[PDB]
Amino acid sequence: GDNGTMMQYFEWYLPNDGTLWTKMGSDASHLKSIGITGVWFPPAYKGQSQSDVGYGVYDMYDLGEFNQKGTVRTKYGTKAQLQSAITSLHNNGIQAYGDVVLNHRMGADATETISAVEVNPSNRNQVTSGAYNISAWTDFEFPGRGNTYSSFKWHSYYFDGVDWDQSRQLSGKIYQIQGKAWDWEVDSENGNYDYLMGADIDYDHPDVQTEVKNWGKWFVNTLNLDGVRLDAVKHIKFDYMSSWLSSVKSTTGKSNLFAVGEYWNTSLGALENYENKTNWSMSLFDVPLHMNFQAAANGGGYYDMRNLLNNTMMKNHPIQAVTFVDNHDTEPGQALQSWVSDWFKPLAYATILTRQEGYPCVFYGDYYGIPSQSVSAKSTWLDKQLSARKSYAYGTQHDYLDNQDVIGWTREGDSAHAGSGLATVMSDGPGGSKTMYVGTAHAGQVFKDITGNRTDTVTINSAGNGTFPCNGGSVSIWVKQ
Ligand SMILES: C[C@H]1O[C@H](O[C@H]2[C@H](O)[C@@H](O)[C@@H](O)O[C@@H]2CO)[C@H](O)[C@@H](O)[C@@H]1N[C@H]1C=C(CO)[C@@H](O[C@H]2O[C@H](CO)[C@@H](O[C@H]3O[C@H](C)[C@@H](N[C@H]4C=C(CO)[C@@H](O)[C@H](O)[C@H]4O)[C@H](O)[C@H]3O)[C@H](O)[C@H]2O)[C@H](O)[C@H]1O
Ligand SMILES: OC[C@H]1O[C@H](O[C@H]2[C@H](O)[C@@H](O)[C@@H](O)O[C@@H]2CO)[C@H](O)[C@@H](O)[C@@H]1O
Ligand SMILES: OC[C@H]1O[C@@H](O)[C@H](O)[C@@H](O)[C@@H]1O
Ligand SMILES: OC[C@H]1O[C@H](O)[C@H](O)[C@@H](O)[C@@H]1O
Ligand SMILES: OC[C@H]1O[C@H](O)[C@H](O)[C@@H](O)[C@@H]1O
Ligand SMILES: [Ca+2]
Ligand SMILES: [Ca+2]
Ligand SMILES: [Ca+2]
Ligand code: NA
């Protein structure tokens, strides 16, 4: 009955030095000590170059094992290093979740000359040219792997489209391969959002349907995975992704394989439509809660803190909510830049770590810092919040989201976790106090601030109430001294 806590074990700007798998393995016992129970590791297969973060997917059967793209290792290291790291996580009781990129492929071995039409980038259902022959990056043969594990080769007729004609080099185009149709259902932004980048996989094609299930089975088996992080699920045929997840569970013996999808949309309704169309079979990153954390941070005291959880997965669908403050895309300089400022970050982490709703995900970029962007490591204060979650965030919750600035909640504690119970209080503005119910069983106990932000103590009265303060623009988490 211990709380679960995920860590995203990478950030965008890590050096291309083939050390991440070695570090992850060495970190396992430390991650266990701070309460991390699952690790999301980056795309572990060969990208279009050695330095690829992993999203520019070339060969999903090359886990840093084959001489392809001028390298054996990936950015992160070798197959054997990743396997050793997962053995070390499992030796420490930590789940391993592999990033799974199924939308597209990049770094084709060869061009193919194929018939295509242009479509409106704002309305991909609208054809805007006659048919003509383009030079497309659609031929994937993987000669460096030489058919090891899989003889499957990719050609144009397994893709729906590309955004580049190597023969004409025109910018701002999207090409639909002749005879192909955008997959459905996908997100309807730009009319049909199947196409994102690269060579867009055709999930209408039955050879592709079979092959990508076969790959999924091989990947989970090969690395003995507990779960998957599914990339760009709003751009992949909804009913196929649902079928893919059922198939891998059934074939790998991983009947309860954990799945969290990235459906990047700021409106809850989009995430609810996805869950509806995939039978509520997977969790989703709580993108709306991340936007709420950004709006509060960016409001400089004037945000209404009563609204912090509104229109979120965490409030509305907590079983399926993977809550986060920042990720590799929201960090400075990246594609979804929407960074939660240092001052607010502890309030955001206290929200996801001490509440009963959601599966929180700690960002590597927050814990260990982002030196290339002058982002300080936050591990010193994160370790105290993670202690709050590991040891104290148990039992019945009472919410006091009843002030524009000062909000809080309590956990009563449960018998399985000795000394458990807490009161979280926080302000986006001036400091304040909240009288909150931690439980009559705490009557006469003295509470301290496990964050160390406050050095005063709080005595629980006989009615099970304390008056819990915080500093301005700060959080305190009150536990039994
Ligand atoms: C980053 C997220 O993008 C999408 O988000 C959209 C929203 O959906 C939309 O509503 C609105 O908010 O705009 C957003 C930004 O566009 C997407 O929905 C979401 O799933 C994405 N996060 C995921 C997905 C991916 C992709 O798998 C990850 O993306 C990251 O890695 C990308 C690939 O390296 C990188 O893309 C940039 O670089 C590539 C190289 C380039 N592609 C061209 C280049 C080549 C070969 O070099 C050829 O293949 C073609 O000519 C081109 O397609 C892109 O043009 C460029 O954008 C991306 O920056 C990076 O974020 C992401 O990490 C996941 O978490
Ligand atoms: O932390 C390991 C834990 O992860 C998953 O449990 C999730 C669950 O699926 C979600 O619905 C939500 O409540 O968060 C849980 C994590 O606390 C795995 O399914 C589970 O087996 C595993 O122990
Ligand atoms: O150092 C320059 C900037 O770095 C960003 O990542 C921060 O959020 C800013 O508040 C800061 O001013
Ligand atoms: O929003 C556009 C979508 O409308 C419909 O559902 C069509 O079946 C689909 O092919 C199309 O892309
Ligand atoms: O959303 C606008 C900007 O808001 C904040 O300043 C964020 O730190 C930055 O990442 C984002 O780009
Ligand atoms: Ca697609
Ligand atoms: Ca199609
Ligand atoms: Ca406020
Ligand atoms: Na497609």
UniProtKB/TrEMBL annotation:
Specify whether Transcription is a keyword of the entry: no
Q: Which UniProt keywords apply?
A: Calcium, Metal-binding
Residues noted as binding Ca(2+) 3 in the record, renumbered to the chain: G301, Y303, Q404, D405, D428
The residues that the entry says bind Ca(2+) 1 are N103, D194, D200, H235
Q: Where does Ca(2+) 2 bind?
A: D160, A181, D183, D202, D204
Whether rRNA-binding counts among this entry's keywords is no
Q: What is this protein called?
A: A-amylase
Q: Which organism is it from?
A: Alicyclobacillus sp
